[PDB]
């Protein structure tokens, strides 16, 4: 290569980045191709390319051209392709191109162009491609386009065209591709596209078309049509009557309201049809003649029925998406074997008959979610073999079929609260992921199976109470609480000659602790009855009356004990201050305390699942709670009262028989807080994300600490009370009498 620019042996030169400011010099007399691009030449002087009469491919891309002399391109009768993109010339050079009559490809795209002169593109009888993309012209040049009739592919995209006049492309008979996208077209004349007999692909994308064009019916041989991301409101009947060979339509991202029934019929070559959000349509489109469809999506419409001949007529269908409609009953899906995916979700289907899905040989994915399904036939899923996904969630199901579902990897059943049955893992041999309404159903399943509702030690799989020592301690708590509470009540009831307010209050709190003992006994007997089988009992226990009774008893006992402790301290203070007759007023106060405890216990009954959070039936579950307000209320209500009584006993201590049993009440307060304030703060702990604690610890510490005050009060009264021993002597005397 004489020139510094490298040159191929087959008389072809390639220069790029050499930074020349002129035409190459010293180059071969004859040359086929010449590519000078990313250079710094701006203007082409006279007969610059005359030195190469044999040139047949010429590239000046990104060279930043601004002026082409009219005679510069003269004499290149052998030119075949000419590329000029990303330059600074603002108009098509009408004179320069006229110097040649033999090239076939001419690119003038991506270079800001404002006006196309009228007799530009004249004499170019051999041109076949034209790139006018990403320029700035605002009106198609009708006469210059009509100058040459032999063009095939034309791009006018990324421009500022707003309207194309009638008969704009009337003389372009050989055109095969026309690109009009990312323009500003909003008005489309109805006599503009005529004459493009051989046009096969039309692109009208990202424009501002407000109504469906009526001109496309003038061009018959259309194959691909793209009008997407335009503001098209409705699609009229007979829109595609003039395009029988039509094979692809792109109409997504248009905000649609109404589509005519006859819009898409008689399109034999159509392969995929997608309609989203056509709200104003309410009947299935007439698809007669469209037999090659392999994907059909109709989402967001108001359709209520599916034709019974749909899947038996569209033999090639493989995907069917009909979601967010309002469909009552499904047709028979037999007669088609290529249907692989089916989506019928967010509809109003209420039942699945036996023959609905029978016959789908190739079905793999099924979606029946957010519906009103209430019963599925036992044989519904038997026929379909290679199913992998099944999604029937947020329906109203009471029972689920196990026939033909062995091979599915994923099954989803959440929100079917009426479904209390047990899923046997023998039926689902292979299953990677599972979602069930309740954790106790997933307890029976466990490369490994993942289950959405976790059994985080607060939904025990085997043992309700848990560790053997914990269960023994709870049994001992219940037994001692029941017997000593019964003994104290018997002694106080029998030694009834005169009833002081303090002795009445001690009897009443011992009465309230007996219900705590009853709750603990309920828990112990339930655990004993369901040992190693609590997966089969948690279902009914939580969603039943037993949990309500147990939770009511627990809350009532705790609140009654706290309130009676408060009044006992108030009574002690008033007595220490001193016919008085507050004794009858204190009985009234006791009645209100019991009345308030009953109200507090009954409050969660009318709420939503407050007692159903835990098998214990306590309102203090793991992490998230059914109602944060109630549990937050109860603890501060209790801690508040604790602080009061504490301050009244502080006042009594400052101030200093009547002095007797003061220590007993103080010990009662002491034990009641050391067994409540710890568990109150700890149950408060999961709300604070800073502190983390294991669910096994919570559950275990909750169970052994909740009834401990009921265990400890009567033994404290029995062993450390001269009054109790005298009452027991009175009991012995009355029994002997």
């Amino acid at each position, epitope marked *: 290569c004489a020139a510094p620019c490298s040159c191929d042996g087959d008389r072809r030169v390639d220069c790029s980045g050499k930074g020349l400011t002129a035409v190459p010099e010293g180059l071969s007399a004859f040359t086929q191709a010449l590519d000078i691009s990313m250079n710094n030449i*701006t*203007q082409l002087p006279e007969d610059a390319f005359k030195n190469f009469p044999f040139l047949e491919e010429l590239q000046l891309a990104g060279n930043d051209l*601004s*002026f082409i*002399h*009219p005679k510069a391109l003269s004499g290149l009768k052998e030119l075949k392709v000419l590329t000029l993109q990303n330059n*600074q*010339l*603002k*108009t*098509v*050079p*009408s*004179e320069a191109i006229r110097g040649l009559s033999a090239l076939q490809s001419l690119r003038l795209d991506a270079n800001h162009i404002t*006006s196309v*002169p*009228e*007799d*530009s593109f004249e004499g170019l009888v051999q041109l076949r491609h034209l790139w006018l993309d990403d320029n700035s012209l605002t009106e198609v040049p009708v006469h210059p386009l009509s100058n040459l009739p032999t063009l095939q592919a034309l791009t006018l995209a990324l421009n500022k065209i707003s309207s194309i006049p009638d008969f704009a492309f009337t003389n372009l008979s050989s055109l095969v591709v026309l690109h009009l996208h990312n323009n500003k077209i909003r008005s489309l004349s109805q006599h503009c596209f005529d004459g493009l007999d051989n046009l096969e692909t039309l692109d009208l994308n990202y424009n501002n078309l407000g109504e469906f064009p009526q001109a496309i019916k003038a061009l018959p041989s259309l194959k691909e049509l793209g009008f997407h991301s335009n503001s098209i409101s409705v699609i009229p009947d007979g829109a595609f009557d003039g395009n029988p060979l039509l094979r692809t339509i792109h109409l997504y991202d248009n905000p649609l309201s109404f589509v005519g029934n006859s819009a898409f019929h008689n399109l034999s070559d159509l392969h995929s049809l997608v309609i989203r959000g056509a709200s104003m349509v309410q009947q299935f489109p007439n698809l007669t003649g469209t037999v090659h469809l392999e994907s059909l999506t109709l989402t967001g419409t108001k359709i209520s029925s599916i034709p019974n001949n749909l899947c038996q007529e569209q033999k090639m269908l493989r995907t069917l998406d009909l979601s967010y409609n309002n469909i009552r009953d499904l047709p028979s899906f037999n007669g088609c074997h290529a249907l692989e995916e089916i989506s019928l979700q967010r509809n109003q289907i209420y039942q699945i008959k036996e023959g609905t899905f029978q016959g789908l040989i190739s079905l793999r994915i099924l979606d029946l979610s957010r519906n009103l399904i209430h019963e599925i036939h036992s044989r519904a899923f038997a026929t379909l073999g290679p199913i992998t996904n099944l999604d029937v969630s947020f329906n109203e199901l009471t029972s689920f079929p196990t026939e033909g579902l062995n091979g599915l990897n994923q099954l989803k059943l959440v929100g079917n609260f009426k479904l209390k049955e047990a899923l046997a893992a023998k039926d689902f041999v292979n299953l990677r992921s599972l979602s069930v309404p309740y954790a106790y159903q997933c307890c029976a399943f466990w490369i490994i199976i993942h289950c959405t509702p976790s059994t985080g030690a607060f939904k025990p799989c085997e043992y309700l109470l848990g560790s053997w020592m914990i269960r023994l301690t709870v049994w001992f708590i219940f037994l001692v609480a029941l017997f000593f509470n019964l003994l104290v009540i018997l002694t106080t009831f029998a030694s009834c000659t005169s009833l002081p307010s303090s002795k009445l209050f001690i009897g009443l709190i011992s009465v309230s602790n007996l219900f705590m003992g009853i709750y603990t006994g309920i828990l112990t007997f339930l655990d004993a009855v369901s040992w190693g089988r609590f997966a089969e009992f948690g279902i009914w226990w939580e969603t039943g009356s037993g949990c309500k009774v147990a939770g009511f008893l627990a809350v009532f006992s705790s609140e009654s004990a706290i309130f009676l402790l408060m009044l006992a301290t108030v009574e002690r203070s008033l007595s220490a201050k001193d016919k008085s007759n507050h004794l009858k007023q204190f009985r009234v106060a006791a009645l209100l305390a019991f009345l308030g405890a009953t109200v507090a216990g009954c409050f969660p009954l009318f709420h939503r699942g407050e007692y159903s959070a835990s098998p214990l039936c306590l309102p203090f579950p793991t992490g998230e709670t059914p109602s944060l307000g109630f549990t937050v209320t109860l603890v501060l209500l209790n801690s508040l009262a604790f602080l009061l009584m504490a301050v009244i006993y502080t006042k009594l201590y400052c101030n200093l028989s009547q002095s007797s049993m003061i220590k007993h009440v103080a010990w009662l307060i002491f034990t009641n807080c050391i067994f409540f304030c710890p568990v109150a703060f700890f149950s408060f702990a999961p709300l604070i994300t800073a502190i983390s604690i294991s669910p096994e610890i919570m559950k275990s510490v909750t169970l052994i600490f909740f009834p401990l005050p009921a265990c400890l009060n009567p033994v404290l009264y029995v062993f450390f009370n001269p009054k109790f021993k005298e009452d027991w002597k009175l009991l012995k005397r009355r029994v002997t009498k």
Partner: nanobody
Framework: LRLSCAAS????????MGWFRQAPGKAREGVAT???????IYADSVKGRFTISQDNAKNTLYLQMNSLKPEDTAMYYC???????????????????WGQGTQVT
């Protein structure tokens, strides 16, 4: 200032005919255009200050301006068209013949 262009060929007045400006490194821009019936066309920043005279008998072209701006330093060209007077022209595309021009400082 006065500056004139002489046409070697026959008078191009019945066809598009005018003046262009060249600034180093950027595109050629037209400033004066003569058409049928002596109609004159100028660009945005040529009104009044820049003017063009045309006649057919003497076969020359005159361009006159006033009160000079160093801003206006450039090489000027006189250009003409002969065939298919499709439209009045301010861009270089529709001009076939170009002259040597002169540098104005």
């Amino acid at each position: 200032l006065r500056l004139s262009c002489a046409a070697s060929g026959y008078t191009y007045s019945p066809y598009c005919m005018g003046w262009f400006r060249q600034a180093p490194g950027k595109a050629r821009e037209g400033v004066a255009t003569v058409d049928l019936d002596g109609s004159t066309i100028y660009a945005d920043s040529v009104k009044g200050r820049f003017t063009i005279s045309q006649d057919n008998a003497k076969n020359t072209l005159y361009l006159q301006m006033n009160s000079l701006k160093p801003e206006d330093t450039a090489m000027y060209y006189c250009a003409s068209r002969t065939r298919a007077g499709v439209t009045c022209g301010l861009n270089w595309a529709i001009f076939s013949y170009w002259g040597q021009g002169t540098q104005v400082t």
